[PDB]
Symmetry: D2
Subunit: 237 residues, 4 copies
């Protein structure tokens, strides 16, 4: 029973399991069936940027995805995350391919967590930033088909020598250190995440997508969670 | 006239202008009559901390004030600030006394602003932090009775040689540089503010309060804005 | 008479004023005749990056300029800057051309200053970052030929309509707010600066260079400081 | 055999292994016999602060230790750390007692590291800050006697229920995630570290001290490294 909170860049509409009929960004609370979605125009071969924002005061998880184009999709969801997540978590990126496929290439990833207590001027904080991924990235936990180093990029799902994506692939990268996501005595608990991605496909349809996620610290890829399950959920319920 | 967005720590109930009948924190949008308030237990002689948070994605302005004993008050309000504030602003702190009085001592003040544009990896950012103020604080514009240096603090309103606060006082401190609070090509426009404060009084009722505010770059203390107007507004409409 | 400390990216050797006979980077303390230089291979048309570092403990002003190549040049100079600079300063970038010319385009600029006092914790900080420059950049003070907005860049020296640089040009940009660069009570005072630049020329000899500098707050371009004087110094003493 | 770089706050002069005949701060490169020391007027039972700065461009490691009254000791040493440390390291704090003893209490600890490659605008960074340590601090690896939670502090060496230090104790805390401290392509590989500590003793002479250190990721407490070896070294060579 892993616990997952995620923001999904979902490139392939699985209408049989509640996806909207178009590519979309979604906020997933413990389920692949997003609590909230917004229409997303995925630009093939373009570098996209995703921003994830949350604070325990406003209690609103917000995401926005944009392209140099200026086009962007935004989704927000009201939720008290310390009611959902355990006190300590790991943070990661996940992606899959299914019958259809795409590259799930991460060019950068940054994260910041802060816990500001009632004790005057006392903050715990964690911040990391990857603008380059080397072949042996020791501060990343790689699961499934994820690899690092290729062009200083992070490839979440399987890519061939020529740079062609493979189907039925799943990969995740988690930051090595546990993250203290909330604390009972913190007046403000907040976090921000940003990553840049390149999704390209020669298919009639790209699949299946990329997600930023927060999980219990021992989280691993659920069995058979390629394709529509985005490497996050054990079932589609 | 000035355009003001503010978070007020209001120590004195002026019920005839919409104040609730108790000390309170409020979010002010272009008026002294808060769009949203919350009951605040002001702790005389104790050091309090205010946190203000906003991002352009969730479009929710939040503030929490707390003391070391864990007592706190929180208020949130949904608003798109790019429809309220001009593109360039100055940020500041303001405080007043009236018939009744209190010290309006600031012990620290920090602010962070970020404009993340659609251009990949293109962020503009401003951040400052004061944990002490000196007698000649050149990066602060002091207006009214505000002074710096007294015990490394910032005294917003007038205080006598022995520490006794004066009545009918108003003072403000604004950060020297203009701040680019929003932009059209910005996918994210967030800001955070924090300050710590010491409000003490020997009156039966302390007055009138402290506020963090955001105004047009040429903002000045409106005529007659002492006491209940918190040095921010020309009138109580 | 201004007080100037600067790191020069000197593209044109003026041997009659103490320059080495090759393009170079140098540390200038109150004089255009560098206290220290190192040979620098400027790459026409490439985006370069300059990093400037200093702290009041090691007391070594250090600079490094690099290209994606990545060839790079480094220069360091042992000096106590709080013996040179005034307590409050402004920071800026400057560039010139003379009989020979080049573009002096700034693509980004960030700066961080910190004063850490003896009082446990208690830090004063200032940080800004520009990754794009709009036509009306209110938090910059532009001097001479300097303009902002052209492709979201900062052009320090004159550029014709077609993108060709003009000769005998001088321009500077300074951050709007005064910076508290040293303080007597501070145990650690440090600053860090970064900028990316694009110098391109069609001349047989590109000239004259770019500099990051720290000066007295009311610093302006000295008369006749184009070309070899880099807009920083009134003469070559 | 571990590789150690360290800044020691040495409270007990072990003159037989090269210690100066007074409490001192030192920079240790692979040896308990400091490459550089400075006299340190240690203040029993007072809260002190250590700042550590590595300037990778200047190749200069510096440390300053101070108390609220302003008294400070400083030490600098020239070294290029990519010649000493492996590419990946862990960072941590260490402390010991021997025949003589002292509390080795850590009240706060922050660390910031930055690898800036030659690829334009590509910076990897890690930052963490602890202003309080909980009883279950999942992002720290505790070794030997080190414990967390007591008054929100980190106790590196054994302390009794009534706050009295024990002799012949050794304990270390390492940040969980491996740190990429240098890389071939990196033009800048600097870091800063800060911690606040409380050393108290009823002994005539407190011993043995506290160190901030950097080591190979699999570093553990060397056999019989209590007392003068500060839990860092296997012997006094
Ligand atoms: C209806 O079932 C068929 O078609 C499905 C596609 O709609 C296909 O789903 C696979 O591929 C999709 C896209 O990659 C992925 O989302 C699913 O998880 C699954 O792997 C079915 O396999 C059938 O062909
Ligand atoms: C008509 O109200 C009388 O009493 C008021 C106080 O309740 C007083 O208000 C003054 O003082 C308050 C508190 O300092 C301040 O909020 C007002 O703006 C004003 O300065 C009125 O003046 C009357 O005496
Ligand atoms: C006397 O030297 C002659 O040639 C010099 C270099 O061509 C020239 O210097 C001008 O241009 C250089 C390079 O742009 C600049 O550094 C000087 O400040 C000056 O403007 C002299 O003027 C002579 O022509
Ligand atoms: C000379 O050797 C004796 O005295 C030594 C120090 O006085 C003592 O060293 C022990 O205690 C010190 C201080 O705690 C510590 O630095 C050593 O590592 C060792 O633990 C010797 O044991 C002798 O008594
Ligand atoms: Ca889907
Ligand atoms: Ca009021
Ligand atoms: Ca020259
Ligand atoms: Ca010793
Ligand atoms: Cl240094
Ligand atoms: Cl060396
Ligand atoms: Mn979906
Ligand atoms: Mn009110
Ligand atoms: Mn020169
Ligand atoms: Mn020693």
């Amino acid at each position: 029973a892993d616990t997952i909170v995620a923001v999904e860049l979902d490139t392939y509409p699985n209408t049989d399991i509640g996806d909207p009929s178009y590519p979309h960004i979604g906020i997933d609370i413990k389920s692949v069936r997003s609590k909230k979605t917004a229409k997303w125009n995925m630009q093939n071969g373009k570098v996209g940027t995703a921003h994830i924002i949350y604070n325990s005061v406003g209690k609103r998880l917000s995401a926005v995805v944009s392209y140099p184009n200026g086009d962007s999709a935004t989704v927000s969801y009201d939720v008290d995350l310390d009611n959902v997540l355990p006190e300590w978590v790991r943070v990661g990126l996940s992606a899959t391919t299914g019958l259809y496929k795409e590259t799930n290439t991460i060019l950068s990833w940054s994260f910041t967590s802060k816990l500001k207590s009632n004790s005057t001027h006392e903050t715990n904080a964690l911040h990391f930033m990857f603008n380059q991924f080397s072949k042996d990235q020791k501060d990343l936990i790689l699961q499934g088909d994820a690899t690092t180093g290729r062009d200083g990029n992070l490839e979440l799902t399987r890519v061939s020598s020529n740079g062609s994506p493979q189907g039925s692939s799943v990969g995740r990268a988690l930051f090595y250190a546990p993250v203290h996501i909330w604390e009972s005595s913190a007046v403000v608990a907040s976090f921000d995440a940003t990553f840049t991605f390149l999704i390209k496909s020669s298919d009639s349809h790209p699949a299946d997508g990329i997600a930023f996620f927060i999980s219990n610290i021992d989280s691993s890829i659920p069995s058979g969670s390629t394709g529509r399950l985005l490497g996050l959920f054990p079932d589609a319920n």
